């Protein structure tokens, strides 16, 4: 008889020296901590008007996760993680209407480790203006989720592709979208 | 490239009916395989795989550690629930509804939370046969969307209506389409 | 209000 779930999720990956810390509420990121600027980044600004979180505290957990990863690596006798490729999907925020601002969403799901290269391509060429993404989000099977966004003006003349690179794929993955 | 090693830690607070029932689950995951966990309904750490036994044995041997964890349901879970209640458990964004041909498509987007009910009608009669949904889609920005299609060859004098029921609205939304 | 984190525990050595 389930109702709600709050998850504090953190990870540390090795060669990369990459770690993340975030809170989740029923699948959505409440906030995550940026290790570099040592700050709490709220998913929606409004949230940061009604709540706070001591970021330093996350830096502390990560330091311990660093030490734990090393201990576990040795305990498992340097057994590498097994790659699991992403499942990619591209869709828009709402129904598309020419001349009406919309947003392309590239959804990367069910993959690990937490390392991906994501490039938006408009008619073959890279697009970066306005783009944004989320941190690697939690999954119940412990794989990850990730979202990339591209605000855009629909047109009969433009084509879009979401390019995803992951150590689990043999070759880059291109997901296509176009006004029907 | 070269070998990767991953360490994941999850603290899951499960709430049932507000905070009348709360279950805390601490999970340690090495390379995607959970090795040891503390389940508030068990009361102590347990190994999930043989790799986690050392940790279960070690942590369970420290009276203070177990003490804090058993009270985390209150000092951690119930506390954080109250902190985001106003913008999480109570967040409400109404669905934008639009209907268009393709198949009759009822697009319900930008809504929160996720539980929604979409129904199709023909001349006042509910069409429960020949409906198709791509399921609830999480946009990852605290909004959902869904598409509920009706297999029909649109005809004249006929009225098609999409009815949407959602927590954000008092009286169901309806968008009708005719030809 | 302020969110509270849960401290990670160091593994057995």
């Amino acid at each position: 008889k389930e109702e709600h779930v709050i998850i504090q999720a953190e990870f540390y990956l090795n060669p990369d020296q990459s770690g993340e810390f975030m809170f989740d509420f029923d699948g959505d990121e409440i906030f995550h901590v940026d290790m570099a600027k040592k700050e709490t980044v709220w998913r929606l600004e409004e949230f940061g008007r009604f709540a706070s979180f001591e970021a330093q505290g996350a830096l502390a957990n990560i330091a311990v996760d660093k030490a734990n990863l090393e201990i576990m690596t040795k305990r498992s006798n340097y057994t590498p993680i097994t790659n699991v490729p992403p499942e990619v999907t591209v869709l828009t925020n709402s129904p598309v209407e020419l001349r009406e601002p919309n947003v392309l969403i590239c959804f990367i799901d069910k993959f690990t480790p937490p390392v991906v290269n994501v490039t938006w391509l408009r008619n073959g060429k890279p697009v970066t203006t306005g783009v944004s993404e989320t941190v690697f989000l939690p999954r119940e099977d412990h794989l990850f989720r990730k979202f990339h966004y591209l605000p855009f003006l629909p047109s009969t003349e433009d084509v879009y592709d979401c390019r995803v690179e992951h150590w689990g794929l043999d070759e880059p993955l291109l997901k296509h979208w176009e006004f029907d | 490239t070269r070998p990767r090693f991953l360490w994941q830690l999850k603290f899951e607070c499960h709430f049932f009916n507000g905070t009348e029932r709360v279950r805390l689950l601490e999970r340690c995951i090495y390379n995607q395989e959970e090795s040891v966990r503390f389940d508030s309904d068990v009361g102590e750490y347990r190994a999930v795989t043989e790799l986690g036994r050392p940790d279960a044995e070690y942590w369970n041997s420290q009276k203070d550690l177990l003490e804090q964890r058993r009270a985390a349901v209150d000092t951690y879970c119930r506390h954080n629930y109250g902190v985001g209640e106003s913008f999480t458990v109570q967040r409400r964004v109404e669905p934008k509804v639009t209907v268009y041909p393709s198949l009759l498509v009822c697009s319900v987007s930008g809504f929160y939370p996720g539980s929604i009910e979409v129904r199709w009608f023909r001349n006042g009669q509910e069409e429960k046969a020949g409906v198709v949904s791509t399921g609830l889609i999480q946009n990852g920005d605290w909004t959902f969307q869904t598409l509920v299609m009706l297999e029909t060859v649109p005809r004249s004098g006929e009225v098609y209506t999409c009815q949407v029921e959602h927590p954000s609205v008092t009286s169901p939304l309806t968008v009708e389409w005719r030809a | 209000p302020k969110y509270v984190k849960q401290n990670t525990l160091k593994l057995a050595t």
Partner: T-cell receptor
Amino acid sequence: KVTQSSRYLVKRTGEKVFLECVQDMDHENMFWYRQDPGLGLRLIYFSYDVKMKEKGDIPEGYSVSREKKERFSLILESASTNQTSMYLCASSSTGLPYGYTFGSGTRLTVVE
Amino acid sequence: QSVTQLGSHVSVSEGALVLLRCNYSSSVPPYLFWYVQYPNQGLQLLLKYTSAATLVKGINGFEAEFKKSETSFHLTKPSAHMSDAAEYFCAVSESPFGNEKLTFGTGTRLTIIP
């Protein structure tokens, strides 16, 4: 045990003073406080990990360094007399069921 | 978070009641600690409030009660002993175990009168 190199130090004003704190328990967290009458212990700086510096409640006049995990060095760029005090160092780990382990402390008097 | 220790110097005749004040400011679940610095030695944890119980019994005969309403955690002892002369420090933290940053009060020096 958390060891502080010296127990007493007499230094001259405008000089660059180094106070060391070395711990051997593999603790991720280390802190530097100063103890003064009627002021109790006040946090100068602290580190939760390697290369992590975080200004405490009274950073002014001090700098710090944590290149290695075992060592947290407190620095006084140009020592002033107001910095004459007893410095306590503490270490701990967020991953441990207990708290602070204090160091011997070092009396430091800076005169002109 | 903050702590205040009203009364920097407290005189108490032995056999008499020892009361060392401590009030705190915490926008979060409080964890308080009482440290003692006996003459010629370092700070010792006397007792700590980990939210387990409200009346915390410490070493060397000391007691402390956490009053969420008064926002206090005063230290008491029915009969002052001469060896109780020392400086007492109150501390507050956000860590259940006191391993993340600690914020200390101004401290009180306790003198026992013979």
